[PDB]
Scaffold this active site. Structure first.
Site, mmCIF file in Angstrom:
data_model
loop_
_atom_site.group_PDB
_atom_site.id
_atom_site.type_symbol
_atom_site.label_atom_id
_atom_site.label_comp_id
_atom_site.label_asym_id
_atom_site.label_seq_id
_atom_site.Cartn_x
_atom_site.Cartn_y
_atom_site.Cartn_z
ATOM 1 N N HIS A 16 0.741 -1.223 0.172
ATOM 2 C CA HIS A 16 0.085 -0.194 -0.062
ATOM 3 C C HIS A 16 0.770 1.421 0.053
ATOM 4 O O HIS A 16 0.435 2.297 -0.640
ATOM 5 C CB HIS A 16 -1.001 0.042 1.092
ATOM 6 N N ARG A 40 -22.761 10.822 19.608
ATOM 7 C CA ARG A 40 -23.340 11.758 19.087
ATOM 8 C C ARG A 40 -24.758 11.497 18.385
ATOM 9 O O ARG A 40 -25.031 10.540 17.905
ATOM 10 C CB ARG A 40 -22.442 12.188 17.966
ATOM 11 N N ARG A 60 -16.819 17.982 24.684
ATOM 12 C CA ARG A 60 -17.964 17.352 24.359
ATOM 13 C C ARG A 60 -19.023 17.761 25.411
ATOM 14 O O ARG A 60 -20.211 17.392 25.314
ATOM 15 C CB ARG A 60 -18.142 15.982 24.066
ATOM 16 N N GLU A 65 3.222 -2.121 7.264
ATOM 17 C CA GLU A 65 4.238 -1.839 6.147
ATOM 18 C C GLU A 65 5.306 -1.122 6.529
ATOM 19 O O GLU A 65 6.637 -1.598 6.221
ATOM 20 C CB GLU A 65 3.429 -1.534 4.953
HETATM 21 C C1 LIG Z 1 -10.876 15.503 16.214
HETATM 22 C C2 LIG Z 1 -11.963 14.617 16.804
HETATM 23 C C3 LIG Z 1 -13.016 15.172 17.617
HETATM 24 C C4 LIG Z 1 -13.790 14.441 18.118
HETATM 25 O O1 LIG Z 1 -14.891 14.773 18.968
HETATM 26 N N1 LIG Z 1 -13.616 12.876 17.864
HETATM 27 C C5 LIG Z 1 -12.707 12.505 17.293
HETATM 28 O O2 LIG Z 1 -12.601 11.401 17.136
HETATM 29 N N2 LIG Z 1 -11.786 13.486 16.684
HETATM 30 NA NA NA Z 2 -26.417 8.877 16.211
#
Ligand SMILES: Cc1cc(O)nc(O)n1
Ligand code: NA
Ligand SMILES: Cc1cc(O)nc(O)n1
Ligand SMILES: Cc1cc(O)nc(O)n1
Ligand SMILES: Cc1cc(O)nc(O)n1
Ligand SMILES: Cc1cc(O)nc(O)n1
Ligand SMILES: Cc1cc(O)nc(O)n1
Ligand SMILES: [Cl-]
Ligand SMILES: [Cl-]
Ligand SMILES: [Cl-]
Ligand SMILES: [Cl-]
Ligand SMILES: [Cl-]
Ligand SMILES: [Cl-]
Ligand SMILES: [Cl-]
Ligand SMILES: [Cl-]
Ligand SMILES: [Cl-]
Ligand SMILES: [Cl-]
Ligand SMILES: [Cl-]
Ligand SMILES: [Cl-]
Ligand SMILES: [Mg+2]
Ligand SMILES: [Mg+2]
Ligand SMILES: [Mg+2]
Ligand SMILES: [Mg+2]
Ligand SMILES: [Mg+2]
Ligand SMILES: [Mg+2]
Ligand SMILES: [Mg+2]
Ligand SMILES: [Mg+2]
Ligand SMILES: [Mg+2]
Ligand SMILES: [Mg+2]
Ligand SMILES: [Mg+2]
Ligand SMILES: [Mg+2]
Ligand SMILES: [Mg+2]
Ligand SMILES: [Mg+2]
Ligand SMILES: [Mg+2]
Ligand SMILES: [Mg+2]
Ligand code: NA
Ligand code: NA
Ligand code: NA
Lengths: 251, 252, 247, 248, 252, 252
Positions: D6, D166, D221, D78
């Site tokens: 790859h 999310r 978050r 690799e």
């Molecule tokens: C940059 C980033 C932000 C986030 O909330 N989650 C991931 O996996 N990457």
């Molecule tokens: Na969802």
């Protein structure tokens, strides 16, 4: 009240709170006729149902079909109709060299190689019989003059790969079951059948009393094809034994 | 001729014993041994205190296990190496059913495997079940002592706290697996919690050893009342009288 | 006020927020006497508890017993009484040929071959030490002059089948553990013991700081069954690691 | 000698490099390489862009991984075939603790394995743990840059959306396994979410390779779901200094 | 109006497209787009190159996925946020059955879930299954091309190396789970390995999206002979011709 | 004479049949057989009733399975031992989607494996999916009968009660695994529940056998449990005509 599959009503059972539950529908009449006033109630699919009287008390005899799923329906629907104690009789294949064809086994716990048990309790929960039923089955089996083994039974959702049989269409056994016979033998497991894990787990987690007694019709380390007279004698003794175990359970 | 690594005893030390009584607490070992004839201290290392005694002329070992399946598994293995084949566990438990009272006895007919060590002997599908003769002897001995006896399923946990759904802890947290678990076991008819039976029963049932468990009830998760002091003393004494009588029945 | 198993109160610990947690109750006094003004507090079952002073600060020494279950009780009850940092010391069996008897190992993560860890976090969660504790243990071990390895430890709920020992009553090992020692060796795992997975998972998921240092007393490439000096050196190291953790 | 399947490079192309810096985004590769001496483009195929450079006179490789454990596992394998033994991951991340701020750095001490590829190297019981020297170097480099640095556990997910709980998504739904999971990880002291560390750390720790991860926080978050320039720039300066410390 | 976080496009950019062709390699996106009318470059970021084109007057998106379920899952999600409902996966593949030849095409009827991302959408019990209309369209397009077409199960792995039981690697180690796995899948009739279908199919089948996978065979783990440049070039070209014809069949 | 352990028939009895129609209920076997030419009763043992018939001059076997994967697995294996290679399952089902009406038909494109027997053939990662030709034939036959036909995923459970999240039961309890499961499957687009397809499809797809499942919807779980008799009779009659026409298409 009515139920979805068994085709009997609560009134049909005449107050029975104990059921004898063989696998084969043809065995139901044979068991019923060992008791008084046997009466045919219904037959639908794998479920043949009779009632009879034992020392004056109503007892129901109902086949389960093969496997945990069909067993689970029968047990549930009988419980809906008032049954609280379930005595399983059937035939089995032994896997230990010291357990002979014609011996009897009373299961003290089952290896859960099934799926339906998980619909009642997670895998950590023990597939074990009610102690009074197991005690009654041991007593009845010993009183008959049989050689009786108490111990662990492997209870499989298949007859073929889950019991590590290779003489099959593909001749293959999935990784999980490759070498499994030897493992269960080393762990002291006595025998294979296909309903006890579901029955025992369902009942032990649901306030129902259950146990299993079986006649040994083959020994896997020997041959697959039973001798007819030997098999007949074993089957006849088993059903006499389960009726005597029922007698011991009546209050 | 070897001396086993943890228990520090030899086969000759056991004077031919093929049966062991295995309490959890090392301090209880002498208390059990003195109910039999000619009790003699053999060794004490870590949580393992070992005595020998004689019951109706036959040698019996008494050996503590410590708390939990891992330390139990070592004691059982090392005793088995030295010829012991039957293991009778006696010990305290908390009941989780309203009909089980402090002072009652429980004989385990099977254990919920909420442990790790059982998996080192058999996969999870295998039943954590006692030997039927041992369970039968324990029931008989318990009944003969005058106690109310319950036969049934025991939940056997690798922890005292979250695995028994206790929230009165440093974090007050219980992981997802165990949230709501007490009610689940109660609804499934489980009688009690303890911390060694799943390991013991699975190990023995899969290794050609005979085992069983009997316990006196000293607290009930569903009853708010404080257990009576006199009842507790009586329960401790009765438990060990019962296990010795169960041993007598196994050696007859 | 007095925790259920350990038989001590918060007042008994005289403000200690760090504990050294050996396995064997008999080694508690030995560790305590490496510090100042050791005081016996309690003994019950596998739990012997002492307090001592280290650079003027109170430190607890408390045995755990063998295995995750008994360890989990001690850690919980000490945490109820204000302890936040836990330093595990003990001995271990190496499974790599280059790790010698007398060497010390500081665990960077544990293979969770236990059950109790699952009572704190699902299996996906890493059994890893607090970085400050691991750093202190490495420094203490290296400063002592020892040969020190950082790496992964396999932490088993059994001494026998889970460490793939065959000189046993049955002489057999369940499928899961058959061939496992070679697998862990191939994966670079350094050693076997029986408490780190529980300790590290419990603490890392509960806001407690923990780490493990161990002296090697057997190499499993040589034999199965182990046969004083390694133990003595290990406890001097863990006391120095405690000194490094004091604030 | 062979060209790996790859990455499109040979061992000779790497000029003896035994250390790689492995960002996710192929566009970041040149940006990292130019912080070192004599950067030279080697190859670009799919998500894999590869440069070589020199750091204090020693050859170093910079190679992108793409998003996720599967593409990362190919690059690491690799590169290892071609002599690389030390892997320093840099990237960005979402914090889940309220005290961890945008712009802070996190050095992973262990990962929650919410991935699949790690299981192709070691069973789930095995810890997704960095090499201690790499983690130590990353902490030192991060601190020396003036950043606020956190050491701790990282949740490493095979998805950006449901596995990071999310809900502003097409289905607006999260499968049972992941419902309530962000709160659970928070309660357990987990610092952050990203998508490659579980695979990288498990693969390397079980294969005789040294690996670690450092990440700049670009979202918290507890504040919102959807997320940078200065955070990315500082992160790569830090990883290059961590590499310097590993080569000393 | 929003611009999706990874793909860098808006709903308006897609000009009403509800179908996407999703190759793995960003370099293949333009090649597929140019098989249709009015191809337009929309964006390139990381492994995600996005074009639009017109097929029988209807807008179609072409978007690369990168390697593996995780990057695929992001592309599918973000396209679905922008109105895409049907996803046609194309690529080339090796095969693990001796009767499958280089140049043949495989349409996946179900995938072995040897990935992690599928579990973020549905538990393992759930089948990684294509939409029946998409599978039907892919079979028809593949057969109409003149190729020999195999309908069957694909093993979908999160790794190229150990999960496909490759031993020619840095360590030569394959973890227990995957030792002997190639032969097991072969015996179970599995046609081929690839690295995205389990995630794609599980995600879509459990989220109200239509998906399928078609692939040209470029290598075979079981055959001695090495295919020549011509056959490989032809196979690559045919695979994308086929997926565009499958898209045509899906248009309403 | 080649014999089998349970079915009570020999290879000679099947007169060269390579295709079986496999209803669940033994009483349905004669009903299906009489739709073909020269139906002949072969055997009845336990839940297994077996007939032979002729369809466009070719021998076909009709064999009941009983309820559940375990009894199904025995019938399929033993028929395969006697030369059968294609298995067409017909039965009744309960829909769980509001848009799937009583009297509609469903052709399963994949099954959620809520069974145990499938695991005796392939690990959980393997897809419980039908042979594409059988599914295609079933769809065509179902459409040609005038039925409203749905293609999609079926949940296949080892229980009728807790595994289908029924609460109107003896205990009224559903284990944690299955609490909230109906809603989850509904949200994931699953069409219906039955109890044999996961075992059948997994066994066949991993063993070189062709299988598929077609079903008439007799209840909808969002509506009522008690079917109307005339509606049920019509649905059952159409289903068996459909499966025979699907067989015809497979044998053409
Ligand atoms: C940059 C980033 C932000 C986030 O909330 N989650 C991931 O996996 N990457
Ligand atoms: Na969802
Ligand atoms: C009668 C019998 C024999 C055998 O070997 N297995 C089962 O399940 N039943
Ligand atoms: C005595 C006792 C009580 C309880 O609740 N749990 C355990 O393990 N033991
Ligand atoms: C001391 C020691 C040695 C060994 O090999 N294993 C364990 O657990 N402990
Ligand atoms: C092209 C190709 C070949 C192969 O063997 N495996 C994967 O994933 N892709
Ligand atoms: C007929 C039918 C209905 C239903 O709801 N579930 C199953 O398994 N079968
Ligand atoms: Cl029977
Ligand atoms: Cl005790
Ligand atoms: Cl110690
Ligand atoms: Cl840390
Ligand atoms: Cl040694
Ligand atoms: Cl990046
Ligand atoms: Cl933010
Ligand atoms: Cl591609
Ligand atoms: Cl762009
Ligand atoms: Cl579909
Ligand atoms: Cl039917
Ligand atoms: Cl009909
Ligand atoms: Mg094999
Ligand atoms: Mg009970
Ligand atoms: Mg000694
Ligand atoms: Mg919760
Ligand atoms: Mg036994
Ligand atoms: Mg083996
Ligand atoms: Mg921490
Ligand atoms: Mg200092
Ligand atoms: Mg929405
Ligand atoms: Mg939910
Ligand atoms: Mg390492
Ligand atoms: Mg191997
Ligand atoms: Mg769909
Ligand atoms: Mg409607
Ligand atoms: Mg309607
Ligand atoms: Mg619940
Ligand atoms: Na059945
Ligand atoms: Na202990
Ligand atoms: Na990627």
């Amino acid at each position: 009240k009515t139920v979805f599959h068994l085709g009997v009503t609560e009134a049909d059972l005449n107050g029975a709170t104990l059921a004898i539950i063989p696998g084969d529908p043809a065995r139901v009449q044979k068991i019923a006729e060992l008791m008084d006033n046997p009466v045919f109630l219904a037959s639908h699919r794998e479920y043949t149902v009779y009632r009879a009287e034992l020392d004056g008390q109503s007892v129901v005899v109902c086949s389960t079909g093969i496997g945990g799923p069909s067993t689970s329906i029968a047990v549930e629907e009988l419980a809906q109709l008032g049954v609280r104690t379930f005595l399983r009789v059937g035939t089995t294949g032994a896997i230990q060299p010291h357990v002979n064809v014609g011996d009897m086994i009373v299961t003290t716990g089952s290896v859960r190689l099934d799926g339906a048990s998980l619909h009642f309790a997670p895998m950590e929960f023990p597939a074990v019989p009610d102690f009074d039923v197991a005690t009654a089955m041991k007593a009845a089996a010993q009183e008959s003059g049989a050689t009786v083994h108490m111990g662990v039974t492997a209870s499989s959702d298949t007859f073929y790969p889950g019991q590590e049989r290779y003489d099959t269409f593909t001749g293959r056994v999935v990784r999980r079951f490759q070498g499994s016979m030897k493992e269960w033998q080393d762990m002291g497991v006595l025998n294979f059948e296909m309903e006890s894990a579901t029955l025992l787990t369902m009942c032990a987690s649901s306030g129902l009393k259950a146990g299993c007694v079986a006649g040994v019709i083959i020994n896997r380390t020997q041959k697959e094809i039973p001798d007819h007279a030997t098999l007949k004698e074993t089957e006849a003794r088993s059903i006499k034994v389960v009726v005597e175990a029922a007698r011991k359970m009546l209050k």
